[PDB]
Write a protein that binds this DNA or RNA. Structure first.
Ligand SMILES: [Mg+2]
Ligand SMILES: [Mg+2]
Ligand SMILES: [Mg+2]
Ligand SMILES: [Mg+2]
Ligand SMILES: [Mg+2]
Ligand SMILES: [Mg+2]
Ligand SMILES: [Mg+2]
Ligand SMILES: [Mg+2]
Ligand SMILES: [Mg+2]
Ligand SMILES: [Mg+2]
Ligand SMILES: [Mg+2]
Ligand SMILES: [Mg+2]
Ligand SMILES: [Mg+2]
Ligand SMILES: [Mg+2]
Ligand SMILES: [Mg+2]
Ligand SMILES: [Mg+2]
Ligand SMILES: [Mg+2]
Ligand SMILES: [Mg+2]
Ligand SMILES: [Mg+2]
Ligand SMILES: [Mg+2]
Ligand SMILES: [Mg+2]
Ligand SMILES: [Mg+2]
Lengths: 136, 116, 79, 177, 52
RNA sequence: CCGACUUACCAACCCGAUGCAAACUGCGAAUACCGGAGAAUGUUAUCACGGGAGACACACGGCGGGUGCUAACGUCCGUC
RNA sequence: UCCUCCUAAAGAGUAACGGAGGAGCACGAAGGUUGGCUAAUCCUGGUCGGACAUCAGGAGGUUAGUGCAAUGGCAUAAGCCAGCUUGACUGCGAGCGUGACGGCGCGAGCAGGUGCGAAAGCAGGUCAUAGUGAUCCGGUGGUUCUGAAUGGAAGGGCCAUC
RNA sequence: UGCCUGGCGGCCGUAGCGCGGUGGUCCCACCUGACCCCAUGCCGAACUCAGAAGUGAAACGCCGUAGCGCCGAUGGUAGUGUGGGGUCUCCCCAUGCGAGAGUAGGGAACUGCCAGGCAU
RNA sequence: GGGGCUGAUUCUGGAUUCGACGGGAUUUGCGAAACCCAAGGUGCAUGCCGAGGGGCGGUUGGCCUCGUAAAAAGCCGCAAAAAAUAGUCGC
């Protein structure tokens, strides 16, 4: 699992994930898998999808993980009361907006890309879709 | 660079005079010529000026760049200010240290009616 | 159970703009209270010990942006 | 300023036709001469600073300026404000007077003097060079000195480029390689 | 240690005085100053004295 | 063997792009709030003083949020 | 108990056993005036001297610094030196901000006497915000007072202060 | 009245950097030397006080350069005050206000006082 | 599953382990790899196909070669198959 090496502060507010995406087009590779729904992807899910696509393509090209988990999500320990401070950090997630590109690749043919992203998408809660880079 | 430093060390007095809203008599000093002129409180109008670049007070001076010419310039500008009604005016060093030529000019202006 | 730190806080000093510009003020009236000199003193405006701009003459409060650094100045128009 | 008045016109005439100059002021000139008695290992005893300030005064008649640290480097365990070394700067007449002494009477007291480095230019050609002893100067003898310290001479010139400074020094007959 | 509290009494015939702080470990010398004296309306020299 | 060389690895600045931040802002809205002018309307609805109280256990929904698991007919703030 | 940032929803204010840090001081100079000055970092040359000092030049312009934790500011510099000094004065004070209140803070200007500056002008502490404790009871010095029949004194009040 | 120069301001990021080379009859700078009267916590590096031998070499200023920094439309998008809704951790419609960034483009500053030196 | 004391020979912010063992920089001789070169000698080589190498096999195929290709020998492995290891300690 990937996470920031260090941060200014350990705990952060819950916040709200509303709005539209910022990076909605593939700018590195030729084929891309982009989230169409709304949710929060975790580092474990990202790593699982990356491993799935890598073993599907046999590393016959390059892989780009556009998103990065940088939001620390904390959960209180089981069987404890309310209050008494904020719970300890549990994991790290990345806020996801609809239309944001998740994974990018190139080199592999269209069939291989679509058969790899098809099995790599099942490791993520948010529904995804396959797109190809265009001329602007 | 020297001119920039002089402006840097004189803009404090410039702003002080501007915020006081009085009349200021400024002194431009160069090794060859020394000017002097009073400025309206708004800072955009000139009421009287005198310098060593004019024949009127240049034809009776040995050299322009000395305390003797600065004294004559101060006397002339003070007399013109008095005859035009200007009597109360502060003195701006314009970044030049108050000594020698500028000090002599200021003393001549003070002695010729213009009280500081 | 447990204990948690950083439970302290400080009382607000009620800073900000008081006259908001365009109002008629009196001599000695405080216009703005601030920590740093966000607004500089202009015409008929004095600077307090804690960078408070107080009008020294009755008139109108005006906000303008002058200076080489585009700093905000408070001006008292004695109309 | 004997060397000054003698060689100024000659070096101007040489350098103008060498570098295709078009004005008298364009010839490279001499700004100042600086020298620092960099006495570092003197924190325990301040007497070393006084000895340095006396030896430098004997070398060039003036009062050396006792310099103070401004960074407090912990590699030597020092605090800023403590005296470290003393610098002397000479302009014009004194610069020329010390230049002739450093040009003429500098060889007898030094050993293995096979010349001086030709690549001692700080890009702009200011010629900072160091000497390993003080008794090299005729003013200071060996009987009256207790310690042995050198100097960090620097002849700061108005030359635009390193080759112009080198030509400047060669015309001033300085012993290069 | 902390800053000791001292009293600067007027050298004149009046018993007027001011109060101030002092660190009497690094500056053992007395605090002689020139202060205004409301009794005589004149600035006079105030020596330093104990807070007693 | 010098290693021919890149060995599904890591790799300072400098540039070219791609994202994130309540304790980042070179920028920056709507609304909120103060003041100046004007018609129309509202039983002065506004302010000052005096007599008399009551009250300082609120809950839900809408909106922006902390906390909680963006769980609770849970809890803590601001407006209706 | 007090202060700085966010939650705090672009005026003020706004809660939690929320998230993050400090304060219970120092300074007769670390204040006032005047004059002067502008770094952090990196590159090149140079005797020890070195990833590091003290020097000479260059790149860069506040990415340094504020006596302190944080925020807002500082080039006219609030940042750094030099000379003189005690305004770190006394009695007031139009007006305003902030609090239910006790309270707290800013403040032009007046009278007396000072310090700096040729002068215009500045100084009623420190770049500002934490560095603090009501009342009662008593101690110390002065007092244009009170003094239980008179004259004092005891005591109390008043001012400064513990 | 037109040329450029000096001083004081308005305007303070189309008003600022890089490159090309010009300016001296004027004004400025460089500079000469310095016991004074002043100065360096060492040196006329800076203040200065006595001047014009030379130079525009560095500056300063001027003319063009689209390499930069910047100013930046229309349209579109995000956001939302009100009312009304859905599949309500978010979104739709009727309404006004409508950003930021990025395109098209603009651009090598204008302007007020005297003080002289220039042709008239 | 949560609090307090230790992780200090100093609490009080500045130990040369005195020494051997890494690493730095300063003052010395030299070897085209600490140098940049064909000029004295005036011989038969650069490279061009190179043969498989001490007892055995092998290195960029040239460190060893020459006539038209073969023994290869300057190093590395088998090999040195003394590495068997303080003081006291039984017949
Ligand atoms: Mg609000
Ligand atoms: Mg009532
Ligand atoms: Mg009532
Ligand atoms: Mg209550
Ligand atoms: Mg109650
Ligand atoms: Mg109840
Ligand atoms: Mg409630
Ligand atoms: Mg509610
Ligand atoms: Mg809610
Ligand atoms: Mg609920
Ligand atoms: Mg309840
Ligand atoms: Mg607010
Ligand atoms: Mg100053
Ligand atoms: Mg005086
Ligand atoms: Mg402070
Ligand atoms: Mg009691
Ligand atoms: Mg009695
Ligand atoms: Mg009594
Ligand atoms: Mg030029
Ligand atoms: Mg539009
Ligand atoms: Mg826009
Ligand atoms: Mg744009």
């Amino acid at each position: 699992m990937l996470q920031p090496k260090r941060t200014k502060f350990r705990k952060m507010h819950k916040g709200r994930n509303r709005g539209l995406a910022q990076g909605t087009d593939v700018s590195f590779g030729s084929f891309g898998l982009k989230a169409v729904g709304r949710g929060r992807l975790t580092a474990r899910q990202i790593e699982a999808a990356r491993r799935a696509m890598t073993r599907a393509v046999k590393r016959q090209g390059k892989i780009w993980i556009r998103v990065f988990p940088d939001k620390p999500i904390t959960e209180k320990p089981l069987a404890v009361r309310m209050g008494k401070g904020k719970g300890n950090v549990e994991y790290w997630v990345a806020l996801i907006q609809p239309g944001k590109v998740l994974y990018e690749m190139d080199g592999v043919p269209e069939e291989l890309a679509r058969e790899a992203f098809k099995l790599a998408a099942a490791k993520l809660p948010i529904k995804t879709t396959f797109v190809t880079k265009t001329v602007m | 660079d020297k001119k920039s430093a002089r402006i840097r060390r004189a803009t404090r007095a410039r702003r002080k005079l501007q915020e006081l809203g009085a009349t200021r008599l400024v002194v431009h000093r160069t090794p060859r010529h020394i000017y002097a002129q009073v400025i309206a409180p708004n800072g955009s109008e000139v009421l009287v000026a005198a310098s060593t670049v004019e024949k009127a007070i240049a034809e009776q001076l040995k050299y322009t760049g000395n305390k003797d010419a600065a004294a004559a310039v101060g006397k002339a500008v003070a007399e013109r200010a008095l005859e035009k009604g200007i009597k109360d005016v502060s003195f701006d060093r314009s970044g030049f240290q108050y000594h020698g030529r500028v000090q002599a000019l200021a003393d001549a202006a003070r002695e010729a009616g213009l009280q500081f | 159970g447990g204990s948690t730190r950083n439970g302290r806080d400080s009382e607000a000093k009620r800073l900000g703009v008081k006259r908001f510009g365009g109002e008629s003020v009196l001599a000695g009236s405080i216009i703005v209270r601030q920590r740093g000199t966000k607004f500089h003193a202009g015409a008929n405006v004095g600077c307090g010990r804690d960078h408070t701009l107080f009008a020294k003459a009755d008139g109108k409060v005006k906000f303008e942006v002058k200076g080489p650094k585009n700093r905000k100045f408070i001006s008292i128009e004695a109309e | 300023a004997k060397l000054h008045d003698y060689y100024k016109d000659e070096v101007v005439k040489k350098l103008m036709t060498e570098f295709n100059y078009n004005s008298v002021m364009q010839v490279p000139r001499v700004e100042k001469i600086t020298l620092n008695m960099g006495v570092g290992e003197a924190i325990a005893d301040k007497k070393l600073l006084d000895n340095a300030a006396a030896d430098l005064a004997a070398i060039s008649g003036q009062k050396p300026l006792i310099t103070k640290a401004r960074k407090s480097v912990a590699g030597f365990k020092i605090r800023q404000g403590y005296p470290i070394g003393c610098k002397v700067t000479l302009r014009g007449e004194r610069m020329w007077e010390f230049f002739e002494r450093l040009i003429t009477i500098a060889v007898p007291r030094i050993r293995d003097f096979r010349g001086l480095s030709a690549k001692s230019f700080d890009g702009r050609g200011n010629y900072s060079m160091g000497v390993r002893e003080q008794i090299i100067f005729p003013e200071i003898d060996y009987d009256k000195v207790d310690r042995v310290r050198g100097l960090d001479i620097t002849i700061t010139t108005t030359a635009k480029s390193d080759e112009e400074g080198r030509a400047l020094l060669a015309a001033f007959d300085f012993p290069f390689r | 240690g902390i800053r000791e509290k001292i009293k600067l009494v007027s050298s004149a015939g009046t018993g007027h005085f001011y109060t101030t702080t002092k660190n009497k470990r690094t500056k053992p010398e007395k605090l002689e100053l020139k202060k205004f004296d409301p009794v005589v309306r004149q600035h006079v020299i105030y020596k330093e004295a104990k807070i007693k």
